Design a protein around this ligand. Structure first.
Ligand SMILES: [Zn+2]
Length: 37
């Protein structure tokens, strides 16, 4: 196909886990790591 929703999946920079979108990754970061400083 000439176009599609490819490459949208994301990874945690702290614990190297994976998510199919950025918003569930941001919730994971705020719940498990919280890089506030
Ligand atoms: Zn993580």
């Amino acid at each position: 196909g000439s176009s599609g929703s490819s490459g949208i999946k994301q990874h945690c920079r702290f614990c190297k886990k994976k998510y199919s979108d950025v918003k569930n990754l941001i919730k994971h970061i705020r719940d498990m790591h919280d890089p506030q400083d």
